From a paper:
TWIK1 (K2P1.1, KCNK1) is a widely expressed pH-gated two-pore domain K+ channel (K2P) that contributes to cardiac rhythm generation and insulin release from pancreatic beta cells. K2Ps assemble as homo- or hetero-dimers, with each subunit containing four transmembrane-spanning helices (TM1–TM4), two selectivity filters (SF1–SF2), two pore helices (PH1–PH2), and two extracellular cap helices (CH1–CH2). To capture structures of TWIK1 in open and closed states within a lipid environment, we reconstituted the channel in nanodiscs containing the lipids DOPE, POPC, and POPS and determined its structure by cryo-EM at pH 7.4 and pH 5.5 to ~3.4 Å resolution.
At high pH, TWIK1 adopts an open conformation. The high pH structure shows an unobstructed path from the intracellular to extracellular solutions through the channel cavity, selectivity filter, and bifurcated extracellular tunnels under the helical cap. At high pH, the selectivity filter adopts a nearly four-fold symmetric conformation with K+ ions bound at five positions in sites S0-S4, as observed in other conductive K+ channels and the previously reported TWIK1 crystal structure at pH 8 (Cα r.m.s.d. within pore helices and selectivity filters = 0.6 Å). At high pH, the residues immediately after the selectivity filter, H122 and D230, project back behind the filter and away from the conduction axis. At high pH, a wide-open path ~3 Å in radius leads from the extracellular solution to the selectivity filter above H122 and D230 and below CH2s. The constriction in the lateral membrane opening at high pH is slightly smaller than the cross-section of an acyl-chain methylene (12.6 Å) and, consistently, similar acyl chain density is not observed in the TWIK cavity at high pH. While the conformation we observe at high pH is likely predominant under these conditions, we cannot exclude the existence of a subpopulation of particles with a slightly larger opening containing cavity bound acyl chains. The high pH reconstruction is more anisotropic due to preferred orientations of particles.
Numbering used by the authors:
A (entry chain A), B (entry chain B): 24 to 280
The structure:
Amino acid sequence: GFLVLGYLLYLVFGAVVFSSVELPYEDLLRQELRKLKRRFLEEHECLSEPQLEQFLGRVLEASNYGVSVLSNASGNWNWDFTSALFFASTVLSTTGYGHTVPLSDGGKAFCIIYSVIGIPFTLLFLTAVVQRVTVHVTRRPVLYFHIRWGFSKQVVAIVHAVLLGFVTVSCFFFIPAAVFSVLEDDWNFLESFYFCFISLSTIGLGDYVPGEGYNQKFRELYKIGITCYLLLGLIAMLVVLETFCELHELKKFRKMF
Amino acid sequence: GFLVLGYLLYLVFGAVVFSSVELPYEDLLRQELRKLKRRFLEEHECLSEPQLEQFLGRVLEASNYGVSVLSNASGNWNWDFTSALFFASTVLSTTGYGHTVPLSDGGKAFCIIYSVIGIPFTLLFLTAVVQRVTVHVTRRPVLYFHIRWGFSKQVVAIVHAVLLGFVTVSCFFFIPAAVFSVLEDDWNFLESFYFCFISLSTIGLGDYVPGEGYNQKFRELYKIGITCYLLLGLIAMLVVLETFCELHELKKFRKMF
Ligand SMILES: CCCCCCCC
Ligand SMILES: CCCCCCCC
Ligand SMILES: [K+]
Ligand SMILES: [K+]
Ligand SMILES: [K+]
Ligand SMILES: [K+]
Ligand SMILES: [K+]
């Protein structure tokens, strides 16, 4: 009741603030992309608006569908054992970057069937893998702290679980942000941090995707390393979110609302 | 151990089957989109490959970033109270269609901050709303069945919870698939079912997004109706997935693996 109105109010607060900050930039880019439309068309006097409209209709449909028209088309194979292993990790993990999606009626039908049983199986996989890590990285330090210093078990967990999140946050955001800032030359640090947040959070917006380097040296090892990092981030934030959910303070908030 | 290998094996099985079915179609489309590249370039002899490569570099970057270059650019406002309410519902619900994402350094920074506290708050919202529905749609019929027929409570829940999923599945897939097949003229039934599965599942691939009708009559009421349907689907599949997780058979599978 009260929360539902608050949630609706919260999106309303979200929509105005984005309208206050994002929309002027978007109006600027939409004004400058429309400027780009008219520069590109002005440059190519031969080229006309309607045929181009149809061409981009297909090109962007495909792009939405995954088949980037970039790299002379002979760029990276959207569907190859490694890339398909990446698509399947993302669709099973719900990230759904959108850089690769099924292109056929039959292909879509298998993806549904594959994802009806695949995703529950993958939730089982991530939950089991997450459960192991909680015993090690988070539970073990808490036990050591209480025994050495001897204060109450109830107070050590709540106060110090918060401390253990910072360790995970730095390990999986800041250091990886620097790593990604080194491997991807065309990224800054802010975009890399944004990509790491969206990927681990599972939003998978798809504006930042790794492995797009033009005929880069280690495409296969790199696609599998990024796959392993993306699961690792998912496991480590399901551990952090499990611990925050376990926290008495956050738990009370849930009970209240 | 055994599961982790199986999960890795499962993606390997996934990658080969997609390579067996999707890749020939993708090779066909990538062969025919490269054909489209060379038809479009062949038609426009004036137009040259490199400048076009740069132009599409920006156009598809923006498209990834959300600003579709379609509808003379003056199409729908990516960021307006309704559309922003939709972006915020999707990013909070993790769907992340990618049709709208932050375009600025400052905008990204707020989206992170907005989504650090927004998403946990939204998980709280969906969980609370889901919890209410379970008491009504699923729990009430089970109680009625046992009293009227008098068989054991343990056996009624497990056998008939499966029955209640079909009701939810038809209510939120088949009938909505027909509804979407009516509102979106350019869709078939299969694509609509695919869109409903990905959206409710939260994959949010973004190849199917509603509200793209060119200056359609009811853009605001329609964007908010689709928003309400997408939450409703999320609530009804978190109820179905809660009940399947509750099921003794599925629970045993989790315990086993
Ligand atoms: C503790 C098990 C880790 C498994 C990682 C798998 C990465 C592909
Ligand atoms: C039972 C509460 C339903 C609220 C739906 C809100 C849709 C925007
Ligand atoms: K997603
Ligand atoms: K996406
Ligand atoms: K996308
Ligand atoms: K998701
Ligand atoms: K997504």
